[PDB]
Design goal:
This is part of a larger assembly, with eight protein chains of seven kinds. Chain A is mainly alpha-helical and 62 residues long. In chain A, 44% of the residues lie in helices and 10% in strands. Chain E is mostly helical and 77 residues long. Chain E has one domain. Classes of the chains: A mainly alpha (62), B mainly alpha (144), C mainly alpha (250), D alpha+beta (161), E mainly alpha (77), F mainly beta (441), H mainly beta (81). Bound molecules: zinc ion (3 copies). The structure holds one RNA strand of 79 nucleotides. Chain B: Belongs to the SF3B1 family.
Chain lengths: 62, 144, 250, 161, 77, 441, 206, 81
RNA sequence: AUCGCUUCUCGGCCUUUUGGCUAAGAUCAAGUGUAGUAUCUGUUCUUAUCAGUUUAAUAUCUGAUGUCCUCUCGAGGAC
């Protein structure tokens, strides 16, 4: 776990890991990830994400 | 007609608010008080902000004259700079562990409150509501 | 005592940091405060300004400036320009040399109008060359040593200094553009550093700085790093609205 | 990440040190935590570039940079540690030379190529101040007769002029 | 400390002040009452709310002055 | 930047009104208050057209407005309570066409505070004293005497500082040359903030109370509290002195009540509603504004209700007491910020959102096939009535107003060269989109 | 054309950037106050005018040197260049010119039937003129209702760079004695003042 | 020490020693508004006295323009009794 | 060259230290009231846990010195 300030004065390691655990969760939350957010309709009037769109796109349909 | 020489004088007051002595900071504070009451309404608020940065640290003080000229500087600066800026300076130390700092911030906030208690209504923070109380003000965030 | 139980309410710093929505704030003594959920929401509000450092200290806030020696105040340029300081230095040296008897003799028979300094010199300083000093925006309280912190942490790659150029072998001045530093050389050679892959090097991953020179001697841009198929190492190492104010005076 | 600022110059200030750290890459730490008595620079410092290859190439670059006018080296944190290297490849550059001869040690003097002055094209010899005499030994051994750019290398301990 | 006789006379003088022990509940409830007194006083936020909900100025000010009594939950303990 | 601020069209919406002979004559003038503006209109009886004589800036907030007549003079002064810590006294000069400041009394700090007086202000019906009052902890009273030259004077003020007490209204009670005295509502948030359970939130009662002067001893003594059944907004004053009894009509939700202290047994009456309406089973009903026509013959009140319906009220009274109440359906007009019931047979219905109206009275609101209601009529059930178009009132005048201007758009959206303004304005059913242009039709 | 000025309900205007090729929505500059905005307007590429629920109009400007493209709670912020307490809730601003060839203007339309304009100045001669006009007018012709004009126009945050045309335009309805006194302080004739008063509405509005 | 029992309409006055200063701010300049005192510190032998010296009321106590900008003049009879 | 001298030259920076005489030429040096701040000056302090009070945290304050015998805070042991 990096030596960022957020844990300074937390000295016990299980506390540190659960702290940085929720911190990790929050950083991943507030990240905008185009894979799951950025979303694509196929031609067929139904929608998928960026990832799956390119997946089935370049494995030979879209 | 201080709206002219306020710029010329600032770097000398910041010079003497970074320590030189008790009396040095007592007197630079008096100067800030009177500049603020003169330049009320002419837009030279960036300069008085800059000098707030230097006066506010003297808030924890003991000598009667020194802390008194400081408090005077903050009333002058309150009319001249507005009560948002000074409520923000006074936010974090209202509920501090200590008691010397709690007491100085409640002294200030009292004087900020007595005069101009009615602006503050649009300057208070957003203070979330826990279980058995309601603390948000939904009145203010009706859309329209 | 009665406190002995509110002290058992006195939660853990991990209790706090996990509860809170913004964990950067949580500090040491935060917990002995009568209302830490408030205190932390406040300290995490926008634009607010934290208590000084020095309420803890047993070392006095200014009395710590006690020790050193300090140089006298330095006037504003536009006031030096008008040449007051030399008038005053001269008068000083005069009256430090003169003796008591001559002092009172000049008291009784004054040197009326010894000197002069013309207006429009003053009035033009104060009304024609007066300029905005450097100010600090909301929040940045001065503390003992606040001024000592010096503008650095220039993380936007391109940040170069003139002594840096000299003691690294590169040029200072208008040639800080057309001078690719000795690190852009191995940027072109094996790549720019893989924690500044969001940094492009000028002349190595960026285009020619204004009027740069391609060539392989000392003083040029060399081979802009490119693939064997022609696409550069990144970006373009070779190189291939209406902000008018509405109310403004004529 | 952590780089030894060696030959750490006295007055060459940590501020411009970090400005060069940025002008090379990730200026994350520039520190020369000195003697608890002196205050001046303590001959070896820690420069953290938070990217490893960034610090690597920044080190290859800021070696031989004339700190206090003197070449100071960014490395991993004069009794004749100079080696003569002949049959020399004239087709090299100076940072290429520092990175080719710095594999077995620091270079306290970049390879000075004994080239003719009439033209600016070399006749095939040089000498290079490395870190150690065992460093010159190992490097000159791995490159004794071995594959230089166009004229195969021939390296060993250097003569004194 | 006669200053304090005057100063808790000041606390008795200005409903809404504080002292170093003041509780989040007193603080926020006093600011809430003041907010109400000014929504009533200023002739125009009244139109804002009157128009935001579909009420009418008598309805509006009657609500407000009813709410003025326990605006922020029940008390602390 | 450097800007200059100009208002093209003043604020039009009306907030307060008074009616009085503000030019000394018996032609009556009306003094209304826009936002930060005091505007005076005089309604001509000939056409029925109201000429807006004097429109003045005051640079403040008019929180309270009340006219008064000195005991026997022919003028109509104005007492204005605004958001400075001052009470101000105003008069008309038609000779200069200008408002004139007679007196000026500071009593505190600026801004629309909470414990500094100015929100409520009442007078004594004869013109002897004024009371200024806040919504907590403060009320003062000023005494008024003509000087020798009859130019008004005003002495120092009295006090009634009582902590932890709201005020929903204050009003002067009509006594006959006794000590004047005032009926305020009240409340007491005190306990409800000592109880961690929220019980005292419920179970607290408005206290219709009277303070009293003592001009001899020069102080204000608390005479008469009485715990009222339920909070009601306000108190209509009963024309006392010689005419009428004394007493107050407490306009509480669903119920209007006569009440006066002394021997009277307190008088009730439920409010008659319209029948077969489409309003939520929960929605109460409150009396919004009132206006009283007290004339040579008799007196009566009008009070209005949320759906805009006006009612007539007169007092069925024996010797010293009144005995019972009759509210009989008059008509329904726009919702009103105020009614100012003239003589000369009109009344000013100050709209609250949109164009405000001047009606003329046609029939006293008496003796037709509209039913009769009463405080004596017992019942298990309510009354009702079925409303109808304008019977007793005739729409003389219609003054325009943009209040509220909920949205705008500048453009040139007719083939004309100069731009028009497209103002989306008005509330609910009475709303509209209205075109403004620089031309005159 | 490619910037966004979002305006939240309580904090402020918040300048947001759309970088298309990475297709990001990223913050670079916001304000230093709380402002319950009701509607904003754009005056240029860096300047935004705002209304407020409590009465005020303000004009906030980005500093001239904004690092537009990059990747307490902000990085760099904007400044405030004017502050005016109109007096009623202002529900729509718009940058516009009214009469043909008239110089630009700000129309503000309140919630009580009020409509008006804020109009720039072209010359410190105009500026200083009305500046002094009203600086005397406050002193010798205060409002009726007890108030002070400076404090009424600086109800919430102090005034900055706005002159009160509706106090200036009161010189007309003043009295000959005072009309003299003040126009003589200006050492212009009441003709000079009143014509310079009227014409400034003439070239902007009607 | 202060009276501060609330204000009124009775002007205050200054002895000639005390002539010129503001009541609290202790200024010497730019006085804007007149002083008012309470009835209780108005009556009797205290009619027309020096709020500061106690000397005879001759010149009028006034309010330094700073004191009026900060409205420290809206508290009432500030008599040091 | 040495060693003894003679003279001169030079270098330090050292050392020297003033304008004679008289009736030491003559003469003579006039601040508070209040508090209070700061600075000097003088001076005074080994305890081993733990419980609490307290404090942002220390500290302070209060209380006996792991228990038991015993000999001189110290010691051998049942533990
Ligand atoms: Zn004073
Ligand atoms: Zn008194
Ligand atoms: Zn005196």
């Amino acid at each position: 776990i990096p030596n960022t300030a957020h844990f300074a004065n937390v000295t016990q390691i299980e506390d540190a890991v659960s702290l940085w655990a929720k911190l990790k969760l929050q950083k991943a939350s507030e990240r905008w990830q185009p894979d799951t957010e950025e979303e694509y309709e196929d031609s067929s009037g139904n929608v998928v994400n960026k990832k799956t769109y390119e997946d089935l796109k370049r494995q030979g349909l879209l | 007609m201080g709206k002219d020489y306020i710029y010329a004088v600032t770097p000398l007051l910041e010079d003497a608010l970074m320590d030189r002595d008790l009396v040095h900071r007592q007197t630079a504070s008096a100067v800030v008080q009177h500049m603020s009451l003169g330049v009320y309404g002419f837009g030279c608020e960036d300069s008085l902000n800059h000098l707030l940065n230097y006066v506010w640290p003297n808030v924890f003080e003991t000598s009667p004259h020194v802390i008194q000229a400081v408090m005077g500087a903050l009333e002058g600066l309150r009319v001249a700079i507005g009560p948002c800026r000074m409520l923000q300076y006074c936010l974090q130390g209202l509920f501090h562990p200590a008691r010397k700092v709690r007491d100085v911030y409640w002294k200030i906030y009292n004087s900020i409150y007595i005069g101009s208690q009615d602006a503050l209504i649009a300057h208070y923070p957003r203070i979330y509501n826990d279980d058995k109380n309601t603390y948000i003000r939904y009145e203010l965030d009706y859309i329209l | 005592s009665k406190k002995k139980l509110r002290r058992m309410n006195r939660f853990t710093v991990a209790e706090l940091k996990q509860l809170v929505a913004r964990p950067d704030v949580v500090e040491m003594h935060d917990v002995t405060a009568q209302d830490p959920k408030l205190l932390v929401h406040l300290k995490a509000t926008r634009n607010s300004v934290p208590v000084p450092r020095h309420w803890c200290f047993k070392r006095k806030y200014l009395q710590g400036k006690r020790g050193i020696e300090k140089p006298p105040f330095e006037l504003p340029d536009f006031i030096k320009r008008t040449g007051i300081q030399e008038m005053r230095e001269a008068l000083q040296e005069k009256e430090e040399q003169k003796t008591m008897k001559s002092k009172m003799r000049e008291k009784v028979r004054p040197k009326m109008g010894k000197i002069d300094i013309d207006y429009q010199k003053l009035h033009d300083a104060f009304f024609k060359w007066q300029t905005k000093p450097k100010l600090t925006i909301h929040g940045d309280l001065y503390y003992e040593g606040k001024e000592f912190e010096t503008r650095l942490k220039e993380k936007k790659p391109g940040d170069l200094s003139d002594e840096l150029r000299i003691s690294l072998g590169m040029p200072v001045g208008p040639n800080a553009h057309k001078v690719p530093p000795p690190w852009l050389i191995a940027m072109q050679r094996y790549g720019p550093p893989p924690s500044y892959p969001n940094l492009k090097i000028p002349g190595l991953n960026s285009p020619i700085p204004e009027s740069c020179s391609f060539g392989y001697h000392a003083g040029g841009w060399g081979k802009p790093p490119v693939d064997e198929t022609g696409k550069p190492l990144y970006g373009d190492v070779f190189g291939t609205i209406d902000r008018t104010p509405w109310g403004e005076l004529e | 990440a952590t780089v030894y600022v060696g030959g750490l110059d006295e007055k060459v200030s940590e501020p411009l040190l970090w400005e060069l750290f940025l002008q090379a890459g990730p200026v994350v730490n520039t520190h020369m935590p000195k003697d608890r008595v002196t205050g001046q620079h303590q001959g070896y410092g820690f420069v953290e570039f938070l990217s490893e290859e960034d610090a690597d190439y920044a080190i290859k670059i800021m070696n031989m940079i004339k700190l206090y006018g003197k070449p100071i080296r960014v490395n991993k944190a004069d009794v004749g540690a100079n080696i003569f290297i002949g049959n020399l490849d004239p087709e090299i550059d100076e940072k290429l030379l520092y990175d080719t001869f710095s594999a077995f040690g620091v270079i306290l003097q970049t390879p000075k190529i004994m080239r003719d002055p009439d033209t600016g094209n070399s006749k095939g010899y040089a000498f290079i101040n490395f870190a150690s005499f065992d460093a010159s030994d190992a490097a000159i051994e791995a490159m004794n007769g071995q594959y230089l750019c166009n004229r195969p290398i021939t390296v060993s301990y250097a003569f004194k002029k | 400390y006669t200053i304090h006789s005057q100063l808790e006379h000041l606390q008795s003088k200005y409903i809404g002040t504080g002292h170093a022990d003041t509780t989040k509940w007193e603080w926020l409830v006093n600011q809430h009452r003041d907010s109400y007194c000014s929504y009533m006083g200023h002739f125009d936020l009244l139109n804002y709310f009157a128009i935001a909900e579909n009420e009418s100025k008598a309805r509006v000010r009657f609500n407000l002055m009813e709410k003025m009594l326990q605006p922020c939950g029940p008390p602390a303990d | 930047m450097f800007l200059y601020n100009l208002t093209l069209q003043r604020a039009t919406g009306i907030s307060f009104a008074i009616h009085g002979n503000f030019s000394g004559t018996k032609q009556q003038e009306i003094v209304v208050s826009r936002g930060k503006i005091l505007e005076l209109l005089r309604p001509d009886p000939n056409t029925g057209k109201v000429h807006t004589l004097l429109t003045v800036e005051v640079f403040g907030v008019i929180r309270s407005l009340m006219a008064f007549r000195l005991t026997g003079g022919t003028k109509d002064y104005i007492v204005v309570g605004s958001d400075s810590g001052r009470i101000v006294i105003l008069e008309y000069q038609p000779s200069k066409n200008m408002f004139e400041k007679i007196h000026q009394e500071t009593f505190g700090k600026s801004g629309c505070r909470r414990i500094v007086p100015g929100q409520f202000l009442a007078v004594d019906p004869k013109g002897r004293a004024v009371m200024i009052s806040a919504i907590e902890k403060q009320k003062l009273v000023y005494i008024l005497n003509r000087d020798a030259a009859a130019r008004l004077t005003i002495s120092s003020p009295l006090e009634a500082h009582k902590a932890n007490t709201l005020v929903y209204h204050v009003v002067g009670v009509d006594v006959g040359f006794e000590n004047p005295m005032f009926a305020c509502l009240e409340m007491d948030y005190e306990e409800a903030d000592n109880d961690p359970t929220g019980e005292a939130a419920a179970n607290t009662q408005q206290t219709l109370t009277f303070y009293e002067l003592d001009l001899g001893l020069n102080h204000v003594v608390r005479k008469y509290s009485e715990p009222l059944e339920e909070h009601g907004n306000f108190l209509i004053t009963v024309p006392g002195g010689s005419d009428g009894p004394s007493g107050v009509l407490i306009c509480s939700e669903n119920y209007i009540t006569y009440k006066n202290f002394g021997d009277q047994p307190d008088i009730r009456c439920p409010i008659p509603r319209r029948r077969n309406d489409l309003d939520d089973p929960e929605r109460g009903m409150i009396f919004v504004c009132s206006a009283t026509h007290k004339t040579k013959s008799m007196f009566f009140f009008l009070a209005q209700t949320e759906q805009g319906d006006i009612f007539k009220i007169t007092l069925e009274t024996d010797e010293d007491m009144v005995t019972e109440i009759r509210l009989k359906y008059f008509d329904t007009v726009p919702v009103a910020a105020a009614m100012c019931v003239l003589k000369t047979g009109f009344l000013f219905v100050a709209s609250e959102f949109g164009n405000h109206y001047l009606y003329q009275i046609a029939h006293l609101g008496d003796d037709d096939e509209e039913p009769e209601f009463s405080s004596a009529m017992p019942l298990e059930d309510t009354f009702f009535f079925q409303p109808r178009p304008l019977k007793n009132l005739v729409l003389v005048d219609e003054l325009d107003s943009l209040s509220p201007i909920l949205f705008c758009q500048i453009a040139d959206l007719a083939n004309e060269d100069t731009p028009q303004l497209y103002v989306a304005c008005g509330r609910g059913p009475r709303s509209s989109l209205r075109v403004l242009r620089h031309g005159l039709e | 054309g490619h910037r966004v000025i979002v305006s939240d309900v309580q904090e402020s205007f918040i300048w947001v950037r759309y970088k298309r090729n990475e297709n990001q929505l990223i913050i670079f500059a916001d304000d230093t106050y709380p402002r319950w905005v009701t509607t904003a307007s754009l005056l240029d590429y860096d300047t935004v005018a705002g209304a407020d629920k409590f009465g005020n109009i303000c004009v906030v400007r980005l500093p001239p040197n904004t690092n537009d493209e990059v990747d307490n709670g902000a990085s760099q912020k904007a400044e405030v260049i004017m502050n005016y307490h109109v007096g009623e809730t202002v529900l729509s601003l718009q940058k516009t010119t009214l009469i043909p060839g008239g110089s630009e203007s700000l129309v503000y339309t309140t919630l009580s039937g009020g409509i008006g304009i804020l109009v720039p100045f072209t010359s410190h001669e105009d500026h200083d003129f009305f500046q002094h006009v009203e600086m005397h007018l406050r002193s010798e012709h205060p409002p009726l209702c007890g108030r002070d004009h400076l404090s009424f126009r600086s109800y919430y945050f102090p005034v900055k760079n706005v002159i009160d045309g509706d106090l200036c335009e009161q010189f007309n309805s003043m009295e000959p004695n005072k009309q003299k006194n003040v126009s003589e302080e200006l050492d212009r004739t009441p003709p000079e003042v009143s014509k310079k008063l009227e014409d400034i509405r003439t070239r902007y509005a009607f | 020490i202060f009276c501060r029992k609330q204000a009124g309409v009775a002007i205050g006055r200054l002895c000639e020693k005390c002539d010129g200063k503001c009541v609290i701010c202790d200024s010497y300049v730019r006085p804007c508004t007149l002083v008012r005192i309470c009835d209780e510190c108005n009556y009797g032998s205290y009619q027309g006295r020096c709020v500061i010296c106690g000397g005879p009321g001759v010149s009028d106590a006034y309010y330094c323009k700073e004191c009026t900008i900060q409205e420290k003049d809206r508290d009432g009879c500030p008599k040091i009794v």
